[PDB]
Every structure is written in structure tokens, then in C-alpha cells.
């Protein structure tokens, strides 16, 4: 159950 | 963090989250010491007994975070790593002596109200403040108690925790554990009979133990959360990597770039 909220690959520095 | 409290936003802008790419996992804490370098504990990266040897391609660092699980869009920053440097004499077999590693970011990170580096200590700061009874502050997203009672969720924090802890006399640290304590470590925590309690816990390792110098009003990272026998056990104390002692190695790696 995804502990972590997902983030877009595009947002990575 | 056990017996800590929620952090105010921006109270520890150098606090970093070491995040495993796969599976997604909060591995440890860490600290930002410039716009290109991050400091953490070596055991968070390398531990042969469990076949642990994370490379730069295995993890990311999350800077500027507050919530433990939410993606804090437009506030935090997720960076890839160019290289990781573990102290060459890190003693994983016996006592985690020299438990320190430097992480070099792929791109320098822009500073903000929530992203700002902490200072590394100088002789003067260490001799005047790293003494028994003087308090330092530890932050992290680690467990709230050594273990849970009924549900796991009761011990996982929703946001970054902070706790203030007193440095403990070396003979007392030595007496509290069977492990061989070296000069490269110090310990902190309240005595077997103080009113207060508090300690770091599973998940806080690699995070910083900081002190605010009355001389120039700046925050200095005196230690790196290293290890403990349980969390907040009376008679036990948390152990920290004595950063100043390993400063020459940090300087050597940075100007050499490993």
C-alpha cells in the first residue's frame, strides 16, 4: 500500500 | 525519534532523507553541508553481513522535506547521486568505528527557506560545547518507539521529529554497553533516572546531532546518529559519530573528489 506518495520522474532534479 | 515533537517548518533545513529507489524505502537520515555534498552514516550504505552495498544508482536524497510520506511538490527536491564515498576504515565488523559517508549530488541544489546547509565544527566549537551535560538536537523520521503495541502505525511519524539530548560522560557511555567505544564516537541521552526521556530510533541513523554555537549563532553538526541497543532504554545511550574527529577525511575526499 505505497507508504510513499509517488512523484513524477520529470520532477527529479 | 522517541519522546520528540513535531518540527516547525524550516527548523532543520539541512535535514536530508536517504531514499531507496527500489523498493521505495526511507533508509536513513542525512545532512546537507553544501549545495553539492551530503553527510550520512556509513552503515546506511555498506554492511557486508546483510549483503548491503548501495551504489549511487541505488538511491536518491530528498531535501527540504517535512512530511515523511507525502510528495512535497514545489518544496522538497529529489536528487540523484553522482558518487558515494564510505570511510575506508569504517569498522563494520566490530563496533561501527568511523561510521561516516559522503554523498556527492549529481547537480548542485539551489537553497531556499527549507533547504540550507549546516556548519561542520572547528576545534573551538568542539572544545567549548562537546562536553558532558551540554545538549544537542537530533531530527529524523525514524520510529517513535522501539516497537509497537497493537498497530504498526502507532510508531511511524507523520512529520519530521526533533528531540534535544544531553552529551553523556565517556566512562558512563563505556559502562552502558559491551561494545568497544572509540574516540571516534560520543554518546547522548538522559540518565537512568532523569525526568525526561528521548533518543533516536530505527530510521534516524545517518541524521545529524546539532548544536547552536553561542559564539556566532550558527548551527553546527557535531555528530551523525550511528547506533544504539534498542531505543530509549533506561541505562542505555545513543551513540554518534564524532564528526570533528573525521574532518580531515572529509576534507581529503571533497578536494580529491574521492
Amino acid at each position: 500500500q505505497n507508504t510513499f506518495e509517488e512523484f513524477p520522474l520529470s520532477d527529479i532534479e | 525519534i522517541v519522546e520528540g515533537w513535531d518540527a516547525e517548518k524550516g527548523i532543520a533545513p539541512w535535514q536530508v532523507m536517504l531514499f531507496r529507489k527500489s523498493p521505495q524505502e526511507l533508509l536513513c537520515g542525512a545532512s546537507l553541508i553544501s549545495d553539492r555534498w551530503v553527510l550520512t552514516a556509513a552503515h546506511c550504505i555498506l554492511y557486508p553481513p546483510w549483503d548491503k552495498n548501495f551504489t549511487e544508482n541505488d538511491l536518491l536524497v530528498r531535501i527540504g522535506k517535512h512530511s515523511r510520506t507525502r510528495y512535497e511538490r514545489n518544496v522538497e527536491k529529489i536528487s540523484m547521486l553522482e558518487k558515494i564515498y564510505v570511510h575506508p576504515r569504517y569498522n563494520w565488523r566490530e563496533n561501527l568505528d568511523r561510521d561516516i559517508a559522503l554523498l556527492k549530488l549529481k547537480k548542485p541544489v539551489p537553497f531556499s527557506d527549507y533547504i540550507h546547509p549546516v556548519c561542520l565544527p572547528d576545534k573551538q566549537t568542539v572544545t567549548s560545547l562537546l562536553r558532558a551535560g551540554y545538549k544537542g538536537r537530533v531530527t529524523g523520521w525514524g520510529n517513535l518507539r522501539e516497537t509497537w503495541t497493537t498497530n504498526i502505525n502507532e510508531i511511524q511519524p507523520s512529520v519530521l521529529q526533533v528531540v534535544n539530548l544531553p552529551i553523556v560522560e565517556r566512562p558512563v557511555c563505556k559502562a552502558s554497553t559491551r561494545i568497544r567505544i572509540t574516540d571516534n564516537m560520543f554518546c547522548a541521552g538522559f540518565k537512568v533516572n532523569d525526568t525526561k526521556r528521548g533518543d533516536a530510533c530505527e530510521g534516524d541513523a545517518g541524521g545529524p546531532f546539532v548544536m547552536k554555537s553561542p559564539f556566532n549563532n550558527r548551527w553546527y553538526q557535531m555528530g551523525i546518529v550511528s547506533w544504539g541497543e534498542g531505543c530509549d532504554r533506561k541505562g542505555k545511550y545513543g551513540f554518534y559519530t564524532h564528526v570533528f574527529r573525521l574532518k580531515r577525511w572529509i576534507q581529503k575526499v571533497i578536494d580529491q573528489f574521492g
Partner: protein, 43 residues
Amino acid sequence: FHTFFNEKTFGLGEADCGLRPLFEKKSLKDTTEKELLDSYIDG
């Protein structure tokens, strides 16, 4: 403040290290930093 590293390899930040944008920079103190100072002085 006296720098110890070289900007070229260390990157930016040393000269302004330890000063928090939302606290020291605004002349604001956090809720518990006094406890740290009290422990350095009491004795």
C-alpha cells in the same frame, strides 16, 4: 565566519552555513532552542 574548504570542490554554502532562513535570518527563535543554550550556560 572562517571557511575551511574550497568552493571549487565543496560547492556553495560554507560562508552562510548554519543560519536558518526562517529563524536566525528573520531574528526568530524556534520553540526549544533555549533549552540548548540553558545547558551550555548552567554550570
